[PDB]
Amino acid sequence: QVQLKQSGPGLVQPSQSLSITCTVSGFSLTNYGVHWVRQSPGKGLEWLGVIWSGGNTDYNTPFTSRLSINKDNSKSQVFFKMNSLQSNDTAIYYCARALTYYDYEFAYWGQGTLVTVSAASTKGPSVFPLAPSSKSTSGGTAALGCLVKDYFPEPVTVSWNSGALTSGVHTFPAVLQSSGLYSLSSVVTVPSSSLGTQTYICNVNHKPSNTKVDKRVEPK
Amino acid sequence: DILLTQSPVILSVSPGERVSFSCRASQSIGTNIHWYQQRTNGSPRLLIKYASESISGIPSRFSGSGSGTDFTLSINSVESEDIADYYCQQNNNWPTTFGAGTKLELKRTVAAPSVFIFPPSDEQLKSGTASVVCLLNNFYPREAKVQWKVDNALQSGNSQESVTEQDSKDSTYSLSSTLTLSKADYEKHKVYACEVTHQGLSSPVTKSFNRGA
């Protein structure tokens, strides 16, 4: 089917430039235009521009001077590049494809790339177990989790048992500590009687820092 | 640039009721409006094109109407999988612009939280910091108080809360309160207690532990 896959989230320092790659499949770049939209706290959803089937570009008015869109048809890649980023350019960037080659009704989206504009530095998280116990069992249900602490910037991805465990998972929204680093917990509830037999692993990935940790969580 | 005004900011309804989203444009745009759904951690999902036209794979309970400047996105019998934000988009005038979105929250019966507490791990303590986590699981509505006590001293300002978005299956929330101490402080005390107040509890629930066991 039709898919658009974007490169990973990252930090860009103020005044520097943002580069995102959209790799498409299920269609040919010679037949469809690819648009770029972003989502920011200040401006909400905001259409940025488009590169059309034939290579022409259009840029929304406030970005004509610092935006540039290119593509390699053979490699099915679209390259987004924006110059001199400031803090209010922190946003989720998307590539999109419309239903028809010429239109703007966006039926297909990339997964988004959260870009943080900050002078700070990237920092991988430490991962600590939230171990089940009696203080965390209620009527045959045990709760367990992973404390994903002191990372920057957002996002971090957390799954359980490599994707196989999804029921009862709550990954909490990150909170920004006074140190300027984020922290979150991911929890899951499971049958207490399975704590003896089953293995529970939170898979942590902090793509901005290339930090992948698998934390086994055991009763203490 | 056409200004699209969505109202209200938040819509709260009960499962099975009807619901309408308003999108008003700053000048006539014909029927050149599209609607999108966005779920927690998702990308937008095209619901309607050109005010009223169906989209492949979209539940039939979604419909849209309107022309000129006043537009409506309707869900005739809402489900909990509909918890999301909803945006309109106009493209009668370049450049295409989007409204600011209406949030859709769901009502349900009161559900008391299940409370769990987690001491700091010995792994964290080696770093010289102590996080104590209190989990309030699968409750409704969203309002809850967590009160931390260390050897009967009330803790203030040294905790942080996080609340999940509403669950798409059972419409509940879960909340985490993290209390952060230094290792030295943590080692200096014994009884760590999380007291939880919620509309679904007839009296506060306290989960506590003594350092060690």
């Binding site: 909400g44 957002e154 | 927690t40 951690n41 999301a84």
Partner: peptide, 12 residues
């Protein structure tokens, strides 16, 4: 009313 980049959901 504003979008939250952590959750991609509108918060106030």
């Amino acid at each position: 009313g504003q979008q939250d980049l952590s959750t991609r959901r509108l918060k106030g």
